[PDB]
Design a protein around this ligand. Structure first.
Ligand SMILES: *[C@@H]1O[C@H](CO)[C@@H](O[C@@H]2O[C@H](CO)[C@@H](O)[C@H](O)[C@H]2NC(C)=O)[C@H](O)[C@H]1NC(C)=O
Ligand SMILES: *[C@@H]1O[C@H](CO)[C@@H](O[C@@H]2O[C@H](CO)[C@@H](O)[C@H](O)[C@H]2NC(C)=O)[C@H](O)[C@H]1NC(C)=O
Ligand SMILES: *[C@@H]1O[C@H](CO)[C@@H](O[C@@H]2O[C@H](CO)[C@@H](O)[C@H](O)[C@H]2NC(C)=O)[C@H](O)[C@H]1NC(C)=O
Ligand SMILES: *[C@@H]1O[C@H](CO)[C@@H](O[C@@H]2O[C@H](CO)[C@@H](O)[C@H](O)[C@H]2NC(C)=O)[C@H](O)[C@H]1NC(C)=O
Ligand SMILES: *[C@@H]1O[C@H](CO)[C@@H](O[C@@H]2O[C@H](CO)[C@@H](O)[C@H](O)[C@H]2NC(C)=O)[C@H](O)[C@H]1NC(C)=O
Ligand SMILES: *[C@@H]1O[C@H](CO)[C@@H](O[C@@H]2O[C@H](CO)[C@@H](O)[C@H](O)[C@H]2NC(C)=O)[C@H](O)[C@H]1NC(C)=O
Ligand code: NAG
Ligand code: NAG
Ligand code: NAG
Ligand code: NAG
Ligand code: NAG
Ligand code: NAG
Ligand code: NAG
Ligand code: NAG
Ligand code: NAG
Ligand code: NAG
Ligand code: NAG
Lengths: 955, 219, 49
């Protein structure tokens, strides 16, 4: 029998108190929704694997399950008999089926209930976590979440590969296995883990872990990277059966004098270096090139053995960077020498002995004698062999006894070619290497192709397929269904849709196009639709239409509406200020003295942040302080039917308008990070917007150009209408309609802003980027950067200065670098905000103070006027535009013939209703009788193309 | 007719900071993690850059709500737009667009993401804008696309520069001929002068150099 | 820099192509009548009349 473990098997990973936080940790936990074995005690004590650790749970009525046995052969015995818990690590004799009734290295003595345990063995410590809770369930494990606490930690040094349970005989239990998975643990206000995300359960969990949140907003996120794994390895070396004569170098009867050292060449052989390294006959074995235990894996184009006799005190001179009587005059090594220096005492071989004599790298320049005597250590003879390794990636001839394999092509493999390794697919090559070229290289100096060590053929190496992995999801408030895109790959190694962006799995391919929702790329978008599921489709670019074009047809608006649109622009960012010394070296004299060695690196960051903070007040003033005086509206709000009560300040409140309050209600330490206040507070900004609104409403644009001069609102609108090419009589004749459309448009603004949180996303995004930047900077304080601790006080309290300073320098570099990264990002972000503020300031002058003639600059339509509203970190513009609503098809002509003269409109166009010709304004159908006061004459009927016959009335 | 060339977007590059620094290496990756968010915040910065490239493209080209097309009868009062309108025999790009496209041009964790809007989708946006501009003047911008005879549209354009519209009509044949010749000159310049599109090629070159520098540093 | 260029290009699309410009040297070196957009790799090309 088996069951579903659901969300069980989580525990507090350490002994640190945390609260109100999502913490990411990697440890041995039971995988969520894992398969666990279900055991019974009815009418069952098998030996089970321990693997990397065991999750255990049981349900009890009569406390039948009392203990466990852990070990190999089956030894750690844990038994809870009555009230006395007994833990022993003793050579106890066990039965083939041990049970309870109803030489030692360690010893300790102390359904209705669910008991959970975690058993893991790390570095000799057997760690036990547990939790007890009441239940009311017989059938199976209860579904729910709880984290287990550490209870016991046994310092045993015991090898556990298997375990067995213990039952009392006259109670079901479950066994699962732990894996090194990362979990996001949710700690509530009281520091209790209440939830968790298994970061390797599915793509939604991956998204939740990546974003460090239990809620995922609608969109596409890159959470991981796909990589094709190798299936098998390939080991290739030349098929050489001769072994290298190292014995003939080290076991030689005689060695040469140091002034005239011997050089033996080793090639075309199998080099077993385990003999030289493991041998205890050597007094020293120092490698400068490679570690002595890697010598049988890597291999050389050649090896040279330099053999000679020196004094014991001269051993220290045979090394790169050394000078002296031997190093300079007898035997010099390159300072970039690659190889091993091996030496041993030869006092019982050479000493009597004056046959040994002494006087550029590897120079043999062919004079004093040594007096080697058996009773001399520093003056005793030593035999030294220097093994010079040419480990350049050339054809290898001297390789160790590494077992070879065959060659596998057109598959992802883990390869080793003469000591050079990597992962990739081996394919046929059309490249030709020169006789002396074993390896090829790319621009990154990675291997491009190789010559097979045994076969004289060229193989191309194409690293195994990989790409980013993105999770496409609706918000988790609607659905937990996800689709996954594997970027820039084929639907091979990975309801599948192949797109140019990669392989999309889980989204249905739909023939119908829709406006783009969640973009994928290359014309493809996805959405959650119909019951509902994720679909993918080619995005629509808009509805298809066609203009009814002809040489004699014009469509002229017969009706219009006044609409109000909202444009939201950032003006300023949070005026953050970071104390670079407190951040890096918080209240630490030792660290501060080291920080000062970096000169101005710290203080110029304080300066850069100060500059950013200062320009935030400049940005705010440029946008809002465009009026010299503070204007107020009259006590009698008579604006010809236009209702501004939602944009003007509310006297009962900070004097913000009703709409401003809606805007403000939607948009939202001790580490040297502080925030400075703005010069202009919300109340002061409200007074500036009030002045601008009062100016705009009662004096039109005159307060902008100069003095604020009163004008009746209806007349102000008359100017605004002429400014868009619409005769002012249209305004007055339809004034009630226009005022009503305006008032309704504002009501629509209210309904949208109060219900759609995303309505102010442009300002919330600024807040979110700044919050993320600050959180990143603080989080970096917890990083070690190679140090023994990320906590400065823990370094100082543990190490003396000669060692502490090194660990501190590691933190200073990381933290100083973190501030530099932060500041650079703040400076670039500040440039974006400044540019936005400049745009907002331009709009304030051209949209609010004046009237714009720039298309789409002050709303999507013909601009009449605008009203500013303040918002957190920015300005919101309500743009009032004139938009054609209804149109009719009229017959037209460029000119009309009277007596042969060509008559053209002074303004407007000629139109025909099917029987009569009229002249009318371009933006509003209003047919007038064609008279000499409406048209002018230039040229004649034999010149104008498309001219038609009519009559022109002469008063 | 003069030509002004402006960059709208840059290559949507994406670099896997772990693969770049510690390519398929467990020992290196474990050391890289000691730097905390230094690696992943770079992945984030590059993602942000790539995303705003689609925003930039949409802001420039997707200014029309509907996709408009020209009529089967190309009667624009003598004005010849056949070199700026989409070619039905081809991706529906214009003759001049093909000339523009014919002049302007790994395993280290460095990959390139596709744009949301492909060359064909951009061509459909420019087609809609051209059709709007030619058959409805500026009305498709302010609101609904309302037909107007091209000669009358030009009359509005002339009044807009302080020139009485009778000048247009009396010289309509001359104006249309100068316009058509001006386009022919655009063709001759773009097809023969590689430097004509240097402003976009420079963007390509800077991005190529940036990517090549990053890869070269691996050595 | 690219974003700023795109912002300029977008402004020009609205003021040069969708409308008619009254801004000197903004939409060609002369009195602006109209413009026609053309696409190009990584950008937009404006033919200013
Ligand atoms: C301007 O609009 C406001 C609504 O935003 C009007 O206020 C409402 O008036 C009606 C009629 O007296 C009341 O029943 C509502 O309860 C009021 N609403 C609020 C929120 O106060 C205001 O009367 C309008 N002013 C003019 C002159 O028309
Ligand atoms: C122009 O359009 C407006 C609406 O935008 C029309 O006004 C509406 O007329 C209907 C009756 O047909 C009323 O029920 C609505 O309450 C009116 N709306 C407003 C805001 O007053 C107007 O009649 C149309 N004019 C013409 C000439 O067609
Ligand atoms: C075009 O407009 C004219 C002028 O309004 C229309 O002629 C008038 O029609 C009304 C009846 O609706 C008569 O009472 C007037 O006496 C007519 N005036 C003249 C000068 O004839 C004409 O019918 C309209 N044509 C179309 C096709 O709608
Ligand atoms: C506008 O009306 C005039 C007459 O006032 C038309 O002139 C006639 O043109 C035809 C064709 O060339 C000649 O055969 C007639 O003899 C002309 N009439 C006179 C009285 O000389 C003119 O063609 C009309 N134009 C349009 C566009 O209808
Ligand atoms: C619009 O301009 C194009 C050229 O760009 C004209 O196409 C040419 O027409 C002539 C005459 O029939 C042919 O000999 C050429 O071979 C055509 N060239 C190409 C490239 O097709 C087109 O006819 C003009 N249209 C109008 C209405 O004038
Ligand atoms: C205004 O300038 C245009 C040219 O830009 C003149 O049109 C040209 O006239 C010559 C004859 O003098 C012809 O050979 C050309 O083919 C014409 N060009 C075009 C495009 O048609 C026009 O005649 C001049 N007008 C005045 C009043 O001087
Ligand atoms: C566990 O695996 C076995 C064997 O494949 C299967 O029969 C059983 O249904 C699985 N149980 C669960 C809970 O997945
Ligand atoms: C529990 O078992 C231990 C032996 O492991 C024994 O010494 C102890 O007396 C037992 N306790 C009870 C209450 O029987
Ligand atoms: C106890 O361990 C020692 C290890 O040297 C072994 O020789 C001895 O026989 C063991 N005794 C028992 C009872 O297992
Ligand atoms: C914290 O404990 C108190 C009781 O002291 C309890 O009332 C409160 O609900 C707990 N908070 C949470 C988040 O469980
Ligand atoms: C080589 O010989 C010249 C004399 O001809 C001498 O000056 C030079 O130092 C010698 N080089 C070495 C490395 O001894
Ligand atoms: C490997 O063995 C083959 C014979 O099977 C031989 O021809 C080839 O030369 C050998 N390669 C090397 C590098 O010795
Ligand atoms: C999101 O979920 C919560 C909890 O069910 C619900 O109260 C809220 O209205 C939901 N919001 C939306 C926009 O669906
Ligand atoms: C995927 O591989 C198949 C061959 O099995 C090929 O026909 C297809 O074009 C490839 N698709 C992509 C996107 O590479
Ligand atoms: C789209 O329709 C065609 C038939 O015209 C069909 O062959 C194709 O499979 C359909 N594709 C999808 C995604 O529905
Ligand atoms: C003009 O006529 C065409 C063709 O019947 C029609 O599609 C278009 O909608 C009409 N326009 C107006 C404003 O009536
Ligand atoms: C307008 O177009 C129609 C249909 O092609 C044509 O018969 C008529 O002559 C044209 N008018 C002018 C002035 O070119």
């Amino acid at each position: 029998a088996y069951t579903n473990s659901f969300t069980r098997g989580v525990y507090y990973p350490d002994k640190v108190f945390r609260s109100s936080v999502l913490h990411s940790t990697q440890d041995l936990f039971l995988p969520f929704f894992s398969n666990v074995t279900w055991f019974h005690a009815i009418h069952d004590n098998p030996v089970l694997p321990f693997n990397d650790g065991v999750y255990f749970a049981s349900t009890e009525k009569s406390n039948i399950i009392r203990g466990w046995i852990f070990g190999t052969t089956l030894s750690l015995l844990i038994v809870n008999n009555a009230t006395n818990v007994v833990i022993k690590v003793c050579e106890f004799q066990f039965c083939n089926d041990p049970f309870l009734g109803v030489n030692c290295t360690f010893e300790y003595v102390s359904f209705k209930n669910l008991r959970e345990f975690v058993f893991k063995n790390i570095d000799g410590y057997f760690k036990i976590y547990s939790k007890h809770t009441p239940i009311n369930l017989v059938r199976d494990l209860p579904q729910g979440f709880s984290a287990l606490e550490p209870l016991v930690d046994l310092p045993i040094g015991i090898n556990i590969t298997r375990f067995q349970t213990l039952l009392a005989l006259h109670a079901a239990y479950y066994v699962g296995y732990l894996q090194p998975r990362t979990f996001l643990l949710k700690y509530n206000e009281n520091g209790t883990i209440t939830d968790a995300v298994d970061c390797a359960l599915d793509p939604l969990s991956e998204t939740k872990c990546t974003l460090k949140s239990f809620t995922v907003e609608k969109g596409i996120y890159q959470t991981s990277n796909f990589r094709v794994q190798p299936t098998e390895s390939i080991v290739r070396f030349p098929n050489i059966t001769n072994l290298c004569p190292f014995g003939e170098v080290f076991n030689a009867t005689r060695f040469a004098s140091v002034y005239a050292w011997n050089r033996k060449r080793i090639s075309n052989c199998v080099a077993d270096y385990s003999v030289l390294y493991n041998s205890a006959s050597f007094s020293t074995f120092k490698c400068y090139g490679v570690s002595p235990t890697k010598l049988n894996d890597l291999c050389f184009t050649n090896v040279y053995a330099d053999s000679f006799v020196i004094r014991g005190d001269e051993v220290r001179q045979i090394a790169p960077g050394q000078t002296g009587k031997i190093a300079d005059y007898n035997y010099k090594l390159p300072d970039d020498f690659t190889g091993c220096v091996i030496a041993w005492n030869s006092n019982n071989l050479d000493s009597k002995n004056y046959n040994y004599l002494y006087r550029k790298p590897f120079e043999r320049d062919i004079l004093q004698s040594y007096g080697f005597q058996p009773t001399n250590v520093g003056y005793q003879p030593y035999r030294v062999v220097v093994l010079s390794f040419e480990l350049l990636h050339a054809p290898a001839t001297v390789c160790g006894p590494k077992k070879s394999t065959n060659l596998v092509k057109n598959k992802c493999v883990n390869f080793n070619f003469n000591g050079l390794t990597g992962t990739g697919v081996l394919t046929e090559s059309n490249k030709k290497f020169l006789p002396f070229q074993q390896f090829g290289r790319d621009i990154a100096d990675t291997t491009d192709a190789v010559r097979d060590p045994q076969t004289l053929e060229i193989l191309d190496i194409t690293p195994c397929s990989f790409g980013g992995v993105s999770v496409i999801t609706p918000g988790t408030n609607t659905s937990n269904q996800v689709a996954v895109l594997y970027q820039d790959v084929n639907c091979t190694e990975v309801n599948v849709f192949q797109t140019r962006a990669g392989c999309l799995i889980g989204a249905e391919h739909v023939n119908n196009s829709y406006e783009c929702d969640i973009p994928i790329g290359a014309g493809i978008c996805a959405s959650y639709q119909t019951s509902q599921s994720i679909i993918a489709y080619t995005m629509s670019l808009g509805a298809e239409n066609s203009v009814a074009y002809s040489n004699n047809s014009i469509a002229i608006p017969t009706n219009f509406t006044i609409s109000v649109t909202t444009e939201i622009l950032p003006v300023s960012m949070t005026k953050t200020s970071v104390d670079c010394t407190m951040y890096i070296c918080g209240d630490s004299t030792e660290c501060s003295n080291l920080l000062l060695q970096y000169g101005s690196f710290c203080t110029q960051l304080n300066r850069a942040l100060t500059g950013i903070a200062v320009e935030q007040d400049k940005n705010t003033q440029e946008v809002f302080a465009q009026v010299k005086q503070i204007y107020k509206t009259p006590p009698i709000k008579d604006f010809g039917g236009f209702n501004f009560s939602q944009i003007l300040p509310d006297p009962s409140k900070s004097k913000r308008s009703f709409i401003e309050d809606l805007l403000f209600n939607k948009v939202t330490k001790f580490n040297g990070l502080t925030v400075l206040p703005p010069l202009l507070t919300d109340e002061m900004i409200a007074q500036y917007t009030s002045a601008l609104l009062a100016g705009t409403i009662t004096s039109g644009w005159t307060f902008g150009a100069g003095a604020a001069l009163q004008i009746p609102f209806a007349m102000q609108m008359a100017y605004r209408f002429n400014g868009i090419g619409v005769t002012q009589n249209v305004l007055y004749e339809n004034q009630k309609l226009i005022a009503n459309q305006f008032n309704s448009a504002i009501g629509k603004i209210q309904d949208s802003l109060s219900s759609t949180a995303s309505a102010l996303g442009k300002l919330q995004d600024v807040v979110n980027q700044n919050a993320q930047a600050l959180n990143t900077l603080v989080k970096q304080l917890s990083s070690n950067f190679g140090a023994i601790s990320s906590v400065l006080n823990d370094i100082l309290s543990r190490l003396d200065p000669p060692e502490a300073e090194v660990q501190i320098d590691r933190l200073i570099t990381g933290r100083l670098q973190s501030l530099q990264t932060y500041v650079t990002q703040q400076l670039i972000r500040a440039a974006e905000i400044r540019a936005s503020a400049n745009l907002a300031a331009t709009k304030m002058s051209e949209c609010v103070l004046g009237q714009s003639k720039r298309v789409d600059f002050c709303g999507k339509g013909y601009h009449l006027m605008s009203f500013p509203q303040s918002a957190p970190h920015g300005v919101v513009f309500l743009h009032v535009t004139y938009v054609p609503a209804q149109e009719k098809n009229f017959t037209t002509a460029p000119a009309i013939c009277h007596d042969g003269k060509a008559h053209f409109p002074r303004e407007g166009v000629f139109v025909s209703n099917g029987t009569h010709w009229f002249v009318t304004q371009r933006n509003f159908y209003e047919p007038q009788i064609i008279t000499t006061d409406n048209t002018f004459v230039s040229g004649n009927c034999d010149v104008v193309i498309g001219i038609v016959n009519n009559t022109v009335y002469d008063p």
